[PDB]
Fold:
Amino acid sequence: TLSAEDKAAVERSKMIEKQLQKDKQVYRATHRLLLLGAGESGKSTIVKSGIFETKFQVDKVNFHMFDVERRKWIQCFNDVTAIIFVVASSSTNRLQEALNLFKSIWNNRWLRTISVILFLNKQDLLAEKVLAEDYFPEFARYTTPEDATPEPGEDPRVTRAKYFIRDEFLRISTASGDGRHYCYPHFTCAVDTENIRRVFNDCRDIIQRMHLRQYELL
Amino acid sequence: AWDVVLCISGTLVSCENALVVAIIVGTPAFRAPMFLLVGSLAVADLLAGLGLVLHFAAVFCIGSAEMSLVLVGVLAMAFTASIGSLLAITVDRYLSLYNALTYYSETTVTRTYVMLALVWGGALGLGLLPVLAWNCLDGLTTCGVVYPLSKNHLVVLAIAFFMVFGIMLQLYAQICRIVCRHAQQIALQRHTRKGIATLAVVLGAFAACWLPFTVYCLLGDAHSPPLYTYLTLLPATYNSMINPIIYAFRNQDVQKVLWA
Amino acid sequence: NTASIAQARKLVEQLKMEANIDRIKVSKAAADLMAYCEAHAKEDPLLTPVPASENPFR
Amino acid sequence: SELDQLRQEAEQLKNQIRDARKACADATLSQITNNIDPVGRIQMRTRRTLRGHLAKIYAMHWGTDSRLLVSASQDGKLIIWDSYTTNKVHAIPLRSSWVMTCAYAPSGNYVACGGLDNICSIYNLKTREGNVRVSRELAGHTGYLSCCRFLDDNQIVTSSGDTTCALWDIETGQQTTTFTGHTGDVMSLSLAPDTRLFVSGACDASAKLWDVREGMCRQTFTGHESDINAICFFPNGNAFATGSDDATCRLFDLRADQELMTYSHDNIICGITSVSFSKSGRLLLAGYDDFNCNVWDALKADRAGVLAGHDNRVSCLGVTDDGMAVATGSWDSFLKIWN
Amino acid sequence: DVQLVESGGGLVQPGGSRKLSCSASGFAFSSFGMHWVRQAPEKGLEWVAYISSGSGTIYYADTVKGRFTISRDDPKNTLFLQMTSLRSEDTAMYYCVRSIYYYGSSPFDFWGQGTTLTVSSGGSDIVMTQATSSVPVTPGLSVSISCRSSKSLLHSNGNTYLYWFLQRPGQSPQLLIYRMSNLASGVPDRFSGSGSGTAFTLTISRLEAEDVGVYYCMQHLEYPLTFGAGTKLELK
Ligand SMILES: CCCCCCCC/C=C\CCCCCCCC(=O)NCCO
Structure:
């Protein structure tokens, strides 16, 4: 049927599809993360011309975290596996804006299947400020959840405020989860070297939960 | 005259598995290892149903001994491929969780091909004995319950449905080990029915359909009443009817494709 | 200071230029879009289906 | 002060413009189109599906021969398809994986691309070495590229996210003209049939009719309550259509200088990502976020069909010069040919 | 910049063997299919071999099948032809040709210098016909060469796979027209191609003194590829 020349064209098409498959084999072997936060949040501390890509490898698994006027571009990112959210534990009352920002991320139409890793940075500053809340009157009627496991040698008031902030984020987290995405919070300090294993494990159990939900086991 | 019931059950099983195979093949998107294994199970069930219809037609219209002897081996290959597809699907499910991160590499495709090859090589190896190696026509080799097959073959093919049930149950226990941890973690910061129901449905139907025959084949001879072998082989076809519903017809994308 | 007056005056000339155009009645500016469609309706494949004999994507 | 009186003068001019526009409007298009026969049900079936892209598809553009087309996706590939036989003529890797637009030279010797790199890249398809090479890199924009369209082998207009368009000279790389006056980011543009004029819609919910020769905003059009994502000239170059986030399309006329018709329905609530016309300008092919593409009757606004075969949102569509087929891309990495 | 340099020629006794090499430099070698085409001293061109891109398809001529083997080495950009059991009819000059196939490309658009091989003394194929074989012309006058085919070349998809080559004395051939109506790149627009089905004509206008040589027609519809006898243009 084909002419002597159309067969060569088809051969070229196949030899192109071969390289396309070879590239797809490596496209799917990397996990894409969307680091997010404000300038003073502490993003630079965690990283250990409008886009700043990065590459790293943990236990033979390659990650493609790339740090990035947010309503449009962030909408084109419905394929990442997890979002890393960095917030400052210190209240000007810009913290509320962060909460608002978080809310906007959670309810977005094209980000309703992307789980969020949450980092609550600047623990030392919060502890110093508390030892030396007022802007959230609801903190008066708050009791530390029993599940709390505060670090040794910590005043109960610091634990109260810390868990108050964490649960304030988790309140909007759990409002409309629907089971398709969750939030993984952590209390990261300035000098902390384990922040990479936390992302590793959270990315692992995100996928484990997705699979379990596929099998109707969860 | 239960043969008519057996034939109609085979026809219904074949219809369901044919629908599953058509849905899977039609869409070029469904080519992941899970879909390959599900399609393998559906094809094996369809082949079993077609074999059961052909043997009813043969013993009803075309009284040929060779055709019956070939089909009473084909059905034995089909119901060994179908109960090997399940043990394949379960080992895929447990490594898609033990290896959640690397599950989307190419080594998974290689292991899927290896499992499929070792599923079909065994259906052929333990489905050719009824014709090739040992039969009941002559030789006096302790003829088994079924018309043309030896007792030894039917003991071997009962020691298998026990080993392949034991491993499957062990792997699902290991899966529940993780499901419990995840459920506890979810319930912690939120202040069981789904997992238990799914496990019971997918692990009790399999057992309560292939334990009756697999026990009859070990505690019976050619002198037992015929109805017994008709009574214990209805659950086997019931399982082939159930499996498509459990696996293929409970996936969101497959259901959406079906709706169109 | 100077920037505000500069941008205001620039917008002033812009508004002059925009408002100095000659506009026509919609009754005539709408009949053209009807005449164009009626005139060219014949050679519009998607509008009028063509037999698969000459359809390159058949 | 000068500011106050200037403000009163500006608002007076605005109200005068509004009053003149109201006076010029006597009979609506819908009233005149009461006697034309309805288009009738439009049934379109897919004919080719073009697989091979690794990620979501952002842009798509036909060739002038109605057979070749180019597509760009998130994975950083620019693929040239022979639609007739579904063949991959070329596959071009990108230096930057953030590309949001693609164009095909009207002659056929070059292609263009750009995105979050703020640079427009022109690729030569007919090198003597038998490969595809980066012919030119145009830089100077302060924001991401939203759209780009060739005027000829030597000139290309581009719209950036810094509210400014441009008109370059590819041989040298220096912008021969610059268009400024928008308030928000410009999201699209559409060259006129004669290439003497073009339009553009921005996030400020306004569309401006520019002039390539000198660079003056001839007219400004408003009426949308949200961003304008897509824009297209009528085949005769005497009108255009705009699609916005408020789930409505609007047909503007240049001569009358005001809106003519609105295409919307209550049961439609999703945004619009792309619009296109038919060779006779009798069908308007919008592309919505609900994975569908309604087919509006341009002269009556009454729907006439749907293109429902995509598994994700439709991000781009186009119609061939001969008006023989319509291609649609989407976020599931497949292009579909329809007719 | 583009060069195809062939080597490995010389004198061979009958029944011996030899190897010809083609070094290609200045273009993307791996993207091009290659041909070996030979011309006996006082004769026209004759296709010999073909190896596609990626070495996924190798064709041989019926006169050399079994004896000749064609191969390529992409990493070092070389093309090889191994000849064994050399007859006395394998005396000729061999040319290395490049060809790229995709929608709208121009195959057969660069020929090497060529190398000489001399050996001491000791069907259903499409036939191309050029009935006329000599034409005397003067500068400033229009010429018309003709070619004929035994089979209809117009393919179903709408193409017509006919090519035109021009060999000047002492130099390798050169592509003028491909698919009988498409002018190549770098050729003056005075040349024009025409024809329909089985009779084809090449028309020349404003003839100059740099158009003296032999003109060949070739068919690419189906293998093997067959050349014409070769019309010759003489100076007055
Ligand atoms: C690598 C995977 C291997 C898994 C093996 C699983 C054990 C096989 C289970 C079940 C096999 C049962 C075979 C029944 C034979 C039917 C005879 C018949 O139809 N007679 C009708 C005439 O009355």
In short: The radius of gyration of chain C is 24 Å.
